[PDB]
């Protein structure tokens, strides 16, 4: 679903530009719903990597 992907997208951008990792918990929960809707979607791996990459910068 395109609406879910845009919601994860916006949560990740918000976490980057505000430095607030609280936005990343929402991206994760939305990502698990995205994965259930379409297990063959190749974008889910990109969202997962993006979320991890943002958490790394914010934690260190």
């Amino acid at each position: 679903r395109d609406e879910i992907k845009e919601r994860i997208f916006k949560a990740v951008v918000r976490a980057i530009v505000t430095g607030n990792p609280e936005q990343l918990k929402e991206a994760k929960k939305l990502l698990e719903k995205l994965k259930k809707l379409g297990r063959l979607d190749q974008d889910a791996k990109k969202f997962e990597k993006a979320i991890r990459q943002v958490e790394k910068r914010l934690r260190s």
């Binding site: 997208f9 990109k46 990459q53």
Partner: protein, 348 residues
């Protein structure tokens, strides 16, 4: 039923059917977690005072009935800020200040069976009836020696009226800004300013007095933008407020973040300035042509701040899009810029 005047009910309720409710309440471990409190048949509850409900922060439903309650302190519900249902029926209340419920989000205010005396101090309750608030219309409340509340004459009853004088034009960082608040009305009790946490975005100097309150915000910073500046005044009838904002112009600024790949790629950015800056991307120093696949998209703006955030979105970029992304941000003060290298796909 229990051998105390107050007995717990449900998960977070207390029901008190005999005299001594307040004493019993304040000896109950965990009373601060009560969400409902029912009280009846008190014999020494002529007054409800600020301290009587101290600590009952979680209280949502409060009922005090059949207890000869005559006087409710204007701050009697200061310690119950979450109260949403308040039933004071079948007491001896002849009046009730608008201050008692100010700031409560009451879905229900029950005043049946009280010898209400109509006066300008009851105009606020008439307004609730007029506006369909608090379940008040269904009560058909009466002025005890007169007719219904819905017909209480009220030509002489009015909250204060306010006029706030503000600069028409924007100001610059470092300016001094003069505001003034003119107050009219009968029986004025108090007036002043509420300045939501300025965070030292201005030096605050008040001057003069009624009927024209003076406010100078001196040496303003850009953070004075979006701050609510409120003039308020109060009489026996009610409270009036007016909130204004001052616009502080200030130069553009821009910052970029490392590109991140999602279903599109994003080069995230933040931009600030007022007037809001115009934005222009360059790629290796040439103006970037925004297309269906490479375009600027903003996050929704926030009411409490002037900064804006967004992305340069890239849908399926190739190695030809590897290079130097510069974001230019310009307003009347000049042009700011930030640059970042971005790589999207290996060279073939």
């Amino acid at each position: 039923s229990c051998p105390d005047a107050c007995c717990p009910h449900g998960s977070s309720g207390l029901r008190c059917t005999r005299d001594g409710a307040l004493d019993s309440l304040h000896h109950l471990p965990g009373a601060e977690n009560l969400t409902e409190l029912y009280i009846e048949n008190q014999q020494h509850l002529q007054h409800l005072e600020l301290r009587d409900l101290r600590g009952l922060g979680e209280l949502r439903n409060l009922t005090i009935v059949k207890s000869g309650l005559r006087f409710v302190a204007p701050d009697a519900f200061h310690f119950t800020p979450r109260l949403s249902r308040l039933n004071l029926s079948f007491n001896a209340l002849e009046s009730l200040s608008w201050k008692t419920v100010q700031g409560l989000s009451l879905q229900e205010l029950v005043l049946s069976g009280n010898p209400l005396h109509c006066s300008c101090a009851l105009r606020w309750l008439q307004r609730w009836e007029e506006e369909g608030l608090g379940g008040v219309p269904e009560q058909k409340l009466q002025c005890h020696g007169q007719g219904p509340l819905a017909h209480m004459p009220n030509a002489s009853c009015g909250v204060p009226t306010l006029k706030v004088q503000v600069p028409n034009a924007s100001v610059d960082v470092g300016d001094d800004v003069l505001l003034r608040c003119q107050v009219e009305g009968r029986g004025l009790e108090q007036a002043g300013w509420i300045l939501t946490e300025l965070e030292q975005s201005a030096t605050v100097m008040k001057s003069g007095g009624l009927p024209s309150l003076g406010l100078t915000l001196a040496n303003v910073t850009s953070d004075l933008n979006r701050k609510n500046l409120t003039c308020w005044a109060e009489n026996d009838v009610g409270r009036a407020e007016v909130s204004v904002q001052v616009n502080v112009s200030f130069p553009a600024s821009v910052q970029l973040h490392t590109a991140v790949e999602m279903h599109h790629w994003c080069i995230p950015f933040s931009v600030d300035g007022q007037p809001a800056p115009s934005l222009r991307w360059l790629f290796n120093g040439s103006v970037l042509n925004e297309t269906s696949f490479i375009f600027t998209e903003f996050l929704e703006p926030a009411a409490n701040e002037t900064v804006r955030h967004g992305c340069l979105r890239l849908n399926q970029p190739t190695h030809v899009n590897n290079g130097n992304y510069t974001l230019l941000a310009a307003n009347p003060f000049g042009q700011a810029s930030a640059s970042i290298m971005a790589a999207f796909m290996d060279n073939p």
